[model samples]
Target: MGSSHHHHHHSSGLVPRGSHMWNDLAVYIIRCSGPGTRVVEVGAGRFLYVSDYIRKHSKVDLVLTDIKPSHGGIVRDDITSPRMEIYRGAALIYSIRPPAEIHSSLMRVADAVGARLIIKPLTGEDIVTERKMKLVNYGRTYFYEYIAEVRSR
Candidate 1:
């Protein structure tokens, strides 16, 4: 089952329930956002830190979704087939460590919704879309932040 527990991160399929390693990232998000802000956690299979932290600390408008939501509490929404309404006005959109396959879609959704994206990919897993997102050092973790969609084609 997907959990916030320490689980390995690899493979396209389920590896571990280790979203908790990004607890510092969660704290950073909480620190970056203000009360009453809107936040969305993508690929939140069963992680409670982000959602739970916002609930406890900030009065944020929070929504959790995953492509395959193992957790009963999360909405079954794919980043590719996103529910625009849920992320319509999100101030911060984050994923603890989303797979690389859907990286483009994630940034697309963020751009479409005009939301700043924070993607904390697996350790040693390079964000192939490096040309698109900017790396930011917030709190104690380093993450890729979606800057803006470039359309020059």
Candidate 2:
């Protein structure tokens, strides 16, 4: 008699799973404008999930910008700089776990660019709602909350 062995493999933590919730926001962008629509990502980290989604999906043109230089590659420039021009003409903007101080400025940038903003904030962070925006909850706990906010202006 011969014995048989079974092996199992799982694809976990390969990409941030919570990113899929942002698909609603992506759909909103696409519905507003079709393929080739320009989207900018602020605080883009290592070009991970968002980059992967943009590569796989063809609806939008993606520009990645980050504050952290050590994360490397695909990052355009720092989000805090007043001179940064990447946000101009962007139709959709996304950020994940951004620090508190930069939030208001980032929102202003989104308004200036006419971009719909989506933020997945780290747990315990406060999000102030505006008349021009609405938050769609993705229902996550202990980690960040996946929020999709559409700009009315």
Candidate 3:
């Protein structure tokens, strides 16, 4: 048996279900993504916490995608070398608790399609992306956001 060398802050376990964090994230994503527009959720591994909530409360066409989809509803696609069509026409792209290594790739895909990128990383995880993302704090939740294309208010 080998001792683990990973230095992760896993004291409290994963984000709890029905937590206000998910609700707050949903609210922010929904606000950025207007009604009837397309929105994409990346790295949406089996957990539907945020995606499901957004679907029930908003009118945006939500697409759930992952590198290895766990169910039929989720589309199988890799963010590093993503399928262009899956992301095109989308107004916003968001990921929850994704690894820091893939932050840049997520940003790349979002910027390629001119969609805003939002990343909700794990606690104390440093963002490693190409462009600088703004830190957002909203209703007991925090995340990083990068706007690809400037839009009028």
Would you estimate the TM-scores of all the predictions?
A: 0.74, 0.62, 0.81
lDDT of 1 by residue, 1-153 (tens): 677888653423323446555666777777766577788888777555666666567777677887676654566766666778888777778886788888888787788877778998765779777587877776567888775443455
What candidate 2 gets wrong by more than 4 Å, as runs, is: 1-34, 68-73, 82-84, 128-132, 138-153
For residues 1-153, write the lDDT of model 2, one tens digit per residue. 876766542323346576555555444445544567677766666535755466456656666677554443446465657543667766667676667677777777776766667666645556554454455543332222223345575
| Candidates in descending lDDT order | 3, 1, 2
Give the least accurate 10-residue stretch of model 2, judged by summed lDDT. Answer: 138-147
User: How many clashing residue pairs appear in each of the predictions shown?
Assistant: 0, 0, 0
Q: Model 2 lDDT vs. the true structure?
A: 0.58
Alpha-carbon deviation at 28 in model 3, angstroms: 0.6
Of the pair 2 and 3, which is ahead by TM-score? 3
Model 3 residue pairs with clashes: none
Candidate 2 to native Cα RMSD, angstroms: 11.4
- In Å, residue 122's CA in model 2 sits off its true spot by 3.8
Q: What is the lDDT of residue 80 in candidate 3?
A: 70
Tens-place lDDT digits, model 3, residues 121-144: 866777776557999898988888
Model 1: lDDT of residue 116: 76
